[PDB]
Design a protein around this ligand. Structure first.
Ligand SMILES: [Mg+2]
Ligand SMILES: [Mg+2]
Ligand SMILES: [Mg+2]
Ligand SMILES: [Mg+2]
Ligand SMILES: [Mg+2]
Ligand SMILES: [Mg+2]
Ligand SMILES: [Mg+2]
Ligand SMILES: [Mg+2]
Ligand SMILES: [Mg+2]
Ligand SMILES: [Mg+2]
Ligand SMILES: [Mg+2]
Ligand SMILES: [Mg+2]
Ligand SMILES: [Mg+2]
Ligand SMILES: [Mg+2]
Ligand SMILES: [Mg+2]
Ligand SMILES: [Mg+2]
Ligand SMILES: [Mg+2]
Ligand SMILES: [Mg+2]
Lengths: 117, 53, 102, 109, 141
RNA sequence: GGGGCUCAAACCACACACCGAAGCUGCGGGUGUCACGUAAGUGACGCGGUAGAGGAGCGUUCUGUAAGCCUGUGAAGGUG
RNA sequence: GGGGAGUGAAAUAGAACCUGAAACCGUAUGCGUACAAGCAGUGGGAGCCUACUUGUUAGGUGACUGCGUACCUUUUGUAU
């Protein structure tokens, strides 16, 4: 029973060349280059799920810091001021109140100063 | 000598961008109404309205 | 009218009429959900925050649907060492809808 | 619109791209004058095709020879005939001999 | 999701700095903070939101200790043996406005945003500026 | 590492605060071994990996089931 | 060599003729690029375009910006 492998090799090549479209040059059209640029573009998509969580945390902090200096503190004395009491509001929903709901942010900052910390 | 890497579709098409054509020195003869080249004998044999050949 | 409710180990910026995607919780479709874990309640300008939590305030929600979103890929490759391993993932979620900020 | 073809024409493709780009989008009155005076091998062949596309619009349709503006000129590639040629120190090498397909398409709009 | 600024909905202002005895690199760290936009709550890294700066005395600036007769400013010309140097004191009589620009330029990113944050800096060796139309407000009193 | 720094942005004592990993915690999924609660109707603490040892699967061609079943209202293929 | 016209169920079945793929080469339409440095991708992301069911939807481009020195084989050890 001779088997010829010319029809199930083709389905696996088109499955590679579909994930690898939108790429420059010969990375999107010939197979011995487009296999390297699918494995490499899958390692980057694995590392950058961790680095996504580090690039917003470093963005939330630098917006609380700018907003809390305009009222009369720093960032580091504000976090010690909120944790003298227990206000328990994270960085994602303080950097929302820093931009949009600016009057409610000032009513938080005055209570950290009243916390004397 | 030889190259070390091949040239892509971009760096091959950029070379041949300085390569176009032109021959627009055309002129209409006043008498016969025949088109020819500027400062040349018309293909019937008239130059500035005079048969020469 | 905006609250800060804490659903799945993380909190949200919930308004009066929001659709909102929450991690999967154990309740059927159509039933109503209350939230007793609100952290600041504002209204017009009248804003109050919790001492650790705000007393008395509730947020009523109900489940629209369920589902799984956006299949992602995982490639664990090592150069030059004869090792490569793949896996797929689709995380569950639960879409709810907010009615009233009590 | 009406078309014309010349499938099988001894000049190569790349040499005859330089005459197609010169006239793509003009009127056929002055298109027959750029090709009457150009000094290249492709220009005598392309004018034989351009006046074949016009005479089809006059006989197969009722299109006048005035309102025609040449719309789509493209030069494809055709079969290549492979031959050898000897070089020095025993080694012989191989020569191709190319051709092309020309398609001039005029439109009466 | 978190808010990002938009370049067609940005608010920029006009500040004027007096450098009349300020230490060079302690002045310049506050210009470079306010050109990038770390003083605004809506700071985003990828698009730019900063205030124009006008500096009105680029010759009264002060450096500390023995650095006036030192601190060569090296740069190379491309040709062989073309290294060149000029100290702090001789430079400030040739072009006073290029002392305070090269200190701020090295405290910015080296991006095509850094080249765009640098165009908001405008220094003058004189005593008045041709920006009375824009009416800059005073800061750092 | 660069700008730049002189009661310091250096050195010595010293005090709180913050920042900081795929580490720990929270929430949601998935699997391996053992224990039973008829051992999944079930808890516990486990899950980097080359050479290499062990376990469990997909697909291709031909034969049985196939004188069946599907198809000219449209097969196999090719392409979305 | 074509453009018709006729034969045929079908000439993009026309004799270099069933199906007719990939590399390679073109022609149209949309969006981005001529003061900006590198395995050319990935995370965030402005704007524009099309269909929408009129847009806390879909599709196509990706200015700007953070991290990022291909694959195999031999090796104590390779971006090399
Ligand atoms: Mg011989
Ligand atoms: Mg001291
Ligand atoms: Mg972490
Ligand atoms: Mg862990
Ligand atoms: Mg293992
Ligand atoms: Mg078969
Ligand atoms: Mg089919
Ligand atoms: Mg018939
Ligand atoms: Mg067909
Ligand atoms: Mg057929
Ligand atoms: Mg053929
Ligand atoms: Mg047949
Ligand atoms: Mg055929
Ligand atoms: Mg092209
Ligand atoms: Mg370059
Ligand atoms: Mg560089
Ligand atoms: Mg070894
Ligand atoms: Mg090598």
């Amino acid at each position: 029973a001779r088997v010829k492998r010319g029809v199930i090799a083709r389905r696996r090549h088109k499955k590679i060349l579909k994930l690898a479209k939108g790429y420059y040059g010969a990375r999107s059209r010939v197979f011995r280059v487009a296999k390297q640029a699918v494995i490499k573009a899958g390692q980057y998509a694995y590392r950058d799920r961790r680095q996504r969580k580090r690039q917003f945390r470093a963005l939330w902090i630098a917006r609380i810091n700018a907003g809390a200096r305009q009222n009369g503190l720093s960032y580091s004395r504000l976090i010690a001021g909120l944790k003298k009491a227990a206000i328990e509001i994270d960085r994602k929903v303080l950097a929302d109140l820093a931009v949009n709901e600016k009057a409610a942010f000032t009513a938080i900052v005055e209570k950290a100063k009243a916390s004397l910390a | 000598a030889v190259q070390q890497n091949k040239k892509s579709r971009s760096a091959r098409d950029m070379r041949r961008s300085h390569d176009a054509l032109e021959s627009n020195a055309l002129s209409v003869e006043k008498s016969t109404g025949e088109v020819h080249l500027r400062h040349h004998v018309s293909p019937d044999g008239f130059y500035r309205g005079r048969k020469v050949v | 009218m905006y609250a800060v409710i804490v659903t799945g180990g993380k909190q949200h910026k919930v308004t009066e009429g929001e659709f909102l995607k929450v991690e999967k919780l154990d309740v059927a479709t159509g039933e109503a959900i209350d939230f007793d874990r609100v952290l600041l309640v504002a209204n017009g300008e009248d804003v109050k925050i919790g001492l650790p939590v705000v007393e008395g305030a509730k947020v009523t929600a109900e489940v629209v649907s369920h589902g799984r979103h956006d299949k992602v890929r995982i490639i664990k490759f090592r150069r030059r060492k004869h090792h490569m391993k793949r896996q797929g993932h689709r995380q569950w979620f639960t879409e709810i809808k907010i009615t009233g900020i009590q | 619109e009406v078309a014309a073809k010349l499938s099988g024409a001894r000049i190569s493709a790349q040499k005859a791209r330089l005459v197609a780009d010169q006239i793509r989008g003009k009127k056929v009155g002055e298109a027959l004058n750029l090709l009457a005076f150009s000094s290249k091998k492709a220009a005598e062949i392309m004018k034989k095709v351009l006046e074949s596309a016009v005479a089809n619009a006059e006989h197969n349709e009722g299109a006048d020879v005035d309102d025609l503006k040449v719309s789509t000129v493209f030069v494809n590639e055709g079969r290549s005939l492979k031959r050898i040629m000897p070089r020095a120190k025993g080694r012989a090498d191989r020569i191709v001999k190319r051709s092309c397909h020309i398609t001039v398409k005029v439109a009466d709009k | 999701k978190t808010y990002t600024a938009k370049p067609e909905t940005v608010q920029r202002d006009w500040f004027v700095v007096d450098a009349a005895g300020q230490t060079l690199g302690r002045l310049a760290t506050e210009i470079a903070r306010r050109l990038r936009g770390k003083h605004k709550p809506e700071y985003t890294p990828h698009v730019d939101t900063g205030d124009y700066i006008v500096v009105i005395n680029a010759e009264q600036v002060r450096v500390t200790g023995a650095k006036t007769t030192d601190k060569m400013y090296y740069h190379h010309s491309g040709f062989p043996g073309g290294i060149k140097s000029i100290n702090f004191e001789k430079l400030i009589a040739k072009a006073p406005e290029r002392v305070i620009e090269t200190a701020v330029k090295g405290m910015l990113p080296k991006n095509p945003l850094g080249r765009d944050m640098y165009r908001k800096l405008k220094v003058y060796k004189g005593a008045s500026h041709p920006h009375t139309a824009q009416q800059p407000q005073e800061l750092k009193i």
